[PDB]
UniProtKB/Swiss-Prot annotation, chain B:
General function of this protein: Specifically methylates the N3 position of the uracil ring of uridine 1498 (m3U1498) in 16S rRNA. Acts on the fully assembled 30S ribosomal subunit.
Domain of life: Bacteria
Protein name in UniProt: Ribosomal RNA small subunit methyltransferase E
Family, per entry: Belongs to the RNA methyltransferase RsmE family.
Length: 235, 196
């Protein structure tokens, strides 16, 4: 039902209809087997959502007519970046997937001291979650970062919370529309005393996320969900 | 290490009545309680694959008091579930092992709603969610209903509304069937524990 088009809103407005080429055609035509007259949801590269009607359906080209510009924006009011210490098994895919459903702006995996242990599949997982959750953007998944490299990234964001153990509601409720937030989590083992020390000197502020102990795949989910509650449900 | 034992009132032990202790010889009672201020019952329409296993686990680490699996209209569908709860309780330092009830039918779900202080239906047709949770007094009961993949059905919503459940959105992004309960629980801890 929902597709990310490699055109801008103004490029789609350009002509009377527009066409879909590549990966998506196959999904439209072969996998779903849609016919002319069928309706889909398209989001441009600049975040604009449209209701489209399949005017033409070929084997490599699909033509669409925009029947409505929804004006719907479902993006979190603030940019939240998830930094995760490489978890085991396939927990990173769950973090990326639910994370996108919950509004995360980008993911940054990093080698962590207790990390006991692909990106092309991660990018794919983020795009599909992005499609199924009606995001106006597809979250970017970065390259696995050394612990050091992560430390050098910190300067780019407005704030940084370190999930470790009540600054959290304060910082989140004091961030303005459009600002950036970095949240780093440790792996199954958890961040190290040494590691916290380096994060805290880079302005990272340690915060608890409730009194219950949360798994690595669970912590970021709580965090995104709380930000949503605060910035969208109360505000 | 932390283990649940059935007797009522080095490792950590937790009585059946919820009293945590450092120990066998009991050396000290911690006095620590990490349960949510309100009793939140998670009612989810039976999902596919192993999604309900996921909900039990994550939801126990996030404070669920109890789980009520039921047959939804769009549902295409116990001992293991209980085991997943207990282990999830163990690792997260809960004081209580949430119980997972027998799978109910929709009807059974409806007959059980009167028990609760407040019933929320995770659904939006139009959000009164923060208003409700912000207003439940400590110790009260909250049942939240969630559909399976595909969602609750309009017919179903109508009958839940006849029984006093209130429809409430959970933000503007479409959440999968296993993501919704984790959001609600997280939001709840945020309101009643981090803001309060």
């Amino acid at each position: 039902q929902r597709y990310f088009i490699e055109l801008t809103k103004q490029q789609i407005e350009e002509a009377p209809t527009f066409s879909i080429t590549g990966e998506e055609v196959h999904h439209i035509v072969n996998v779903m087997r849609m016919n002319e007259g069928d309706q889909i949801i398209c989001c441009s590269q600049d975040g604009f959502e449209a209701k489209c009607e399949l005017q033409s359906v070929s084997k490599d080209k699909v033509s669409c007519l925009v029947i409505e510009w929804t004006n719907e924006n479902r993006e979190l009011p603030i940019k939240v970046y998830i930094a995760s210490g490489l978890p085991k098994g396939d927990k990173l895919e769950w973090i990326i997937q639910k994370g996108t459903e919950l509004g995360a702006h980008a993911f940054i995996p990093f080698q962590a001291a207790r990390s006991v242990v692909k990106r092309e599949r991660w990018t794919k997982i983020a795009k599909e979650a992005a499609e199924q959750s009606y995001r106006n953007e597809v979250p970017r998944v970065m390259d696995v970062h050394s612990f050091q490299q992560l430390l050098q990234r910190m300067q780019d964001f407005d704030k940084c919370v370190v999930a470790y153990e009540s600054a959290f509601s304060a910082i989140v409720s004091s961030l303005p529309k459009g600002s950036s937030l970095l949240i780093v989590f440790g792996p199954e083992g958890g961040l190290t005393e040494a590691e916290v020390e380096r994060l805290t000197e880079q302005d990272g502020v340690t915060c608890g996320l409730g009194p219950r102990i949360l798994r690595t795949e669970t912590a970021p989910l709580y965090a995104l969900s709380a930000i949503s509650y605060q910035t969208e449900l109360l505000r």
